[PDB]
Amino acid sequence: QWEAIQPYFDNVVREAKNFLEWSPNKRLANAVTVAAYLTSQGLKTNQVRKILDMARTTELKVKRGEGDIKDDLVKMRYLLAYTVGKATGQSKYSLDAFHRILDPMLEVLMGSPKKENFEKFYDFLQAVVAYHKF
Amino acid sequence: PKFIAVKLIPKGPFRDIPRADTLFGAIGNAISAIHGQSAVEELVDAFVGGARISSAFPYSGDTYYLPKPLSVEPALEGILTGLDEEERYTTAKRLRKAKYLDLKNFELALRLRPFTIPEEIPYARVDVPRVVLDRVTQDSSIYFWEEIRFREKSGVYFLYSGPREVFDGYIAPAMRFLGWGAGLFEVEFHEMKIDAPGSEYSVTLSNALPTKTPVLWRLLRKGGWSFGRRKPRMTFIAEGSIVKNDPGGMERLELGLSHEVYVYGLTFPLGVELPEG
Amino acid sequence: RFYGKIVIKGKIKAVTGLHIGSNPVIKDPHTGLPYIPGSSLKGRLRSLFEILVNSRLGEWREKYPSLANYSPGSCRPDNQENCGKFFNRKINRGWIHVCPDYETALACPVCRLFGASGKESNFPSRIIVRDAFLTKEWEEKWRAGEAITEAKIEVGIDRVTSQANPRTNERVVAGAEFEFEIIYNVENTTHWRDDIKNLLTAMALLEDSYLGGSGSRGYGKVKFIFDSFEFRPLDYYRTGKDEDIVSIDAREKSVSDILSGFDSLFSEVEGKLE
Amino acid sequence: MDRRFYGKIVIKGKIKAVTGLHIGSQPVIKDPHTGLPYIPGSSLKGRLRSLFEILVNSRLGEWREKYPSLANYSPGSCRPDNQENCGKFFNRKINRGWIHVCPDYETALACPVCRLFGASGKESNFPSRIIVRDAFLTKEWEEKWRAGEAITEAKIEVGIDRVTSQANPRTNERVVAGAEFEFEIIYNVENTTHWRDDIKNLLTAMALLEDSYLGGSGSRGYGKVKFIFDSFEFRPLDYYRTGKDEDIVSIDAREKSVSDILSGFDSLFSE
RNA sequence: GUGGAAAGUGGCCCGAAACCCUUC
């Protein structure tokens, strides 16, 4: 089922927290394995669906809505730990695998980065999602 | 020969590539529109009688394509001896799809040297299935009427081997007059250079009406209504063949209108040394 | 003669998108972009204008004197050409308006602004509707993706089973300026004022009716924001360093441009007039 | 045979839907760039037309001479006899369903539905004479969406049948109750005697749509559209040809119960 | 003095039918 290469791929993403100036296959080649660990545990979609709506709305705010996501990125950062605190037993044992990636990414990526800088993270946000079903 | 070029930046589709005589029709209607009624090509008779038009391809970038020195079709196997013994089929690329060539593969596509064919051709001869409509009701009537369609940065050009006084007096005002939608047109003048060796027998660069002198030439048949009544067929040499036993095939007077339409076909040389024939 | 080539240059915003078809897909020439073909713009721009003068033929009748032998109708009941109802020209199924002679079509206000043919007539259309080609905002918008088309699905809902069926449409994205242009020959200077007023009338019939395919349920609703009325009298071609009219550009609403600033725009072109 | 328009009466819409709205696509339906809700014209036109022809199906027994080409039909259904024309007031197999389409011109010129929503078929194909704009979300809710306070909130249903309720759920993502959709609707006016019995014939359908729903699962809510009109104005050919900034404007006070401004239809009207 | 001159890929079509976010 779960094997230690998969949290070590998560640890490559979490300790090599810098993906922003990296290759566009460094995202996808890890995003399978990440989601593989994220589908090795349960991680059903409907509690993750609160996160993705905050992405797509801020993605439309990227597409000529504002200059950046300055204050609204906090509630993207907040609601992950909120779901962690809400998660109980069969979920907080598992949902932290989704949690341990977006916080250390968005830490320095709340440096008010460019829309072309954040799009490289939003593509990873999308990139995790489909391999839940695959 | 430092003959200048005229690059026509399009903005969209053309009906056809203008076939080196339809411009001289269009130049005629242009100088019929401007300059009154008697500064028209009757007055420009002795001025195109020493200077030529001779259309050619688009460019697709800045690589000014040029049609073919047709004097490489006889002894193509005499050219490509340097290749391996599977050179036939590159000859079929340089005979059957032999359409247009780069300049660097045109100063040595003649003069008996191993040229190379290009492939970035800015054609989209597309099949645009246009209009179907009745003013009150349905209409089914898919009548096609296809047109040509270009690339992103391409465009037709043509040449001008003449004195620049005559160019800027008739044709250069007319080349901005030309600018149903397919007349999309922005004009940008230029100069050009061609190496062009000794002038025994060489290319015409136009569509051609010769004076009875046949040497290795694709035949053409060009119609054209040209203010109403259908012009005759007027058998032509195609783009770029070799009639240089002293040409000067005069423009042909026609009949049908009040003032005569008279069709182009007078050519201008280049440099080729052809193998035999 | 020729004292001509008025350039109306502008941008047409499709407020709810377009469906100039060819799954039905839009016309996409060589780069994958869509575009309004200038054929469709001229065609809808003559259908609206021809039905306008179909309603209004019996009352103009002195201005445009050749439009008096018609007495409105279509010649689809009496299946013959040249029938005096309004319009014959049976092409394959349709019936459009074309005057069958040049001498008549020097005066028919629709026909002398989009031309005439058939047998021994040959009137040139006096207008050049350039195809509009996706101005440089939405070209650079397209380069990063942005999905310039939009697959839209409708259904034929029944009422005794309430079943349905996919009929996809794939229209252009709602809101896209297209770099719209119009070139017009200004032969017969006495005709010209009413002529470009009539072209602006036909364009003002748009923004209130459907361009582009399956209209009347969305899919049309275009807006001309045309910037620069120009002029190219007879000196723009023999020369062209200077000396041509450039009109006001910014917020010219076509339902207000038609006369409320037009005679303030006409009189500068009256300054050349030759 | 003539189209012969002079007219284009327009109504400026404003369908503030209350209690939800779920129009569907491939989830609400904004395919263009400004992600939003909107009502795409054709879902309003088809819900107008099917409801109006359901009214005409029951009320054909008393008009029956007015709109004379209606009298070629029966109030039944072409469901059992699967022929594309049967003599009943339902025909025109689309792919598996049936809609009312008069397959002629002169039978469609008089038909009280088909003179207002267009014919099709062999050789005939009447133009619909009504123009149903795509209803985009108004500028007020655009400004109130830029500032947070989100529109298009989701909603979960379940299939809790009369078994052990292991009900598989299904989210729907309807539009929030209260959404001004800035609607616009144009009707081409031709040959005036053919006119006053048309928009009065039209609004009743919208009145029925004021009682019924549009947009999706309307049997469990999701309707209540409340067409609070804005313009009721009319744009004659006397200024499409010569635009002097003049127009013939009606009044949009609250609504009409049943055609209270039938008298004010003809206030300054000859065409 | 232009293989020309006139020629809306158009007309019709609800993304609809049903479903208690509730039980153990």
How far apart CA D7 and CA D133 sit, in angstroms, is: 17
Task: Give chain D positions within 8 Å (CB) of C73.
Answer: 1-2
- CA B210 remoteness from chain centre: 16
- The answer to whether the annotation marks D100 as part of a ligand binding site is yes
Instruction: Give the Cβ contact number of residue C134 at 10 Å.
Output: 20
Is residue C151 helix, strand or coil? coil
Residue C135 buriedness (CB in 10 A; 0-12 / 13-18 / 19+): middle
Task: Give chain C positions within 8 Å (CB) of D2.
Answer: 54, 72-74
How far apart CA B212 and CA B189 sit, in angstroms, is: 35
Q: What beta strand segments (E) does chain B contain?
A: 4-9, 55-58, 156-160, 186-191, 219-220, 236-237, 252-253, 262-263
Residue D78 buriedness (CB in 10 A; 0-12 / 13-18 / 19+): buried
Residue in D28, D34, D36, D155 to test binding to A, most A beta-carbons within 10 Å: D34
DSSP summary character for residue C10:
E
- Asked if D131 and C216 come within 8 Å (Cβ–Cβ), the reply is yes
Protein-proximal positions, strand E, CB < 7 A:
1-23
- Asked if C128 and B176 come within 8 Å (Cβ–Cβ), the reply is no
B94: left (phi over 0), alpha (psi -120 to 50) or beta: alpha
User: Which residue type, as a one-letter code, is found at position C136?
Assistant: K
Nearest CB to D243: which of C93, C221, C259?
C259
Experimental technique behind these coordinates: cryo-EM
Task: Give chain D positions within 8 Å (CB) of C174.
Answer: 32, 134, 136
- The answer to whether the annotation marks D111 as part of a ligand binding site is yes
Chains that touch A (3 or more CB pairs under 8 A): D
Query: What is the distance between the terminal CA atoms of chain D, rounded to a whole angstrom?
Result: 20
Query: For B252, phi and psi rounded to 5 degrees?
Result: -100, 125
The pair of structure tokens assigned to C17 is 């998108």
User: Where is D130: in which H helix or E strand?
Assistant: strand D130-132
Given a contact cutoff of 8 angstroms between Cβ atoms, the answer to whether D138 and D182 are in contact is yes
How far apart, in Å, are the Cα atoms of A46 and each of A43, A131, B28, D22? 9, 15, 73, 20
B105: left (phi over 0), alpha (psi -120 to 50) or beta: alpha
What is the distance in angstroms between the Cα of B138 and the nearest Cα belonging to chain D? 6
Q: What beta strand segments (E) does B110-224 contain?
A: 156-160, 186-191, 219-220
How far apart, in Å, are the Cα atoms of B146 and each of B20, B130, B229, C76? 21, 8, 23, 29
User: Whole-number Å distance, CA C164 to C1' E11?
Assistant: 20
The pair of structure tokens assigned to D71 is 């009298």
User: Whole-number Å distance, CA D171 to C1' E23?
Assistant: 19
The pair of structure tokens assigned to D40 is 């795409």
Beta bridge partners of B4: B160, B191
- The answer to whether the annotation marks C30 as part of a ligand binding site is no
Under 8 Å CB pairs connecting chains B and D tally to: 14
> DSSP H helical segments within C15-111, as ranges?
38-55, 57-60
Chains that touch B (3 or more CB pairs under 8 A): C, D
C27 touches B: beta carbon within 8 Å? yes
User: Which residue type, as a one-letter code, is found at position C231?
Assistant: F
B127 touches C: beta carbon within 8 Å? no
Q: What beta strand segments (E) does C122-162 contain?
A: 127-128, 149-150, 153-154
How far apart, in Å, are the Cα atoms of B17 and each of B21, B241, C132? 11, 18, 22
Residue D268 buriedness (CB in 10 A; 0-12 / 13-18 / 19+): exposed
So where are chain C's domains? Answer: 1-274
How far apart, in Å, are the Cα atoms of D264 and each of B20, C41, C72, D208, D267? 68, 37, 31, 22, 5
- CA A55 remoteness from chain centre: 10
> DSSP H helical segments within D124-261, as ranges?
139-146, 196-211, 237-240
Stated resolution in angstroms = 3.3
User: Which residue type, as a one-letter code, is found at position C25?
Assistant: V
Longest dimension (CA), chain A: 44
Using C1' positions and the CA of C164, the closest nucleotide is: E16
Closest CA to D40 of D170, D193, D214: D214
Given a contact cutoff of 8 angstroms between Cβ atoms, the answer to whether D247 and D233 are in contact is yes
Given a contact cutoff of 8 angstroms between Cβ atoms, the answer to whether C55 and C70 are in contact is no
B136 touches D: beta carbon within 8 Å? yes
Given a contact cutoff of 8 angstroms between Cβ atoms, the answer to whether B262 and B155 are in contact is no
D128 touches B: beta carbon within 8 Å? no
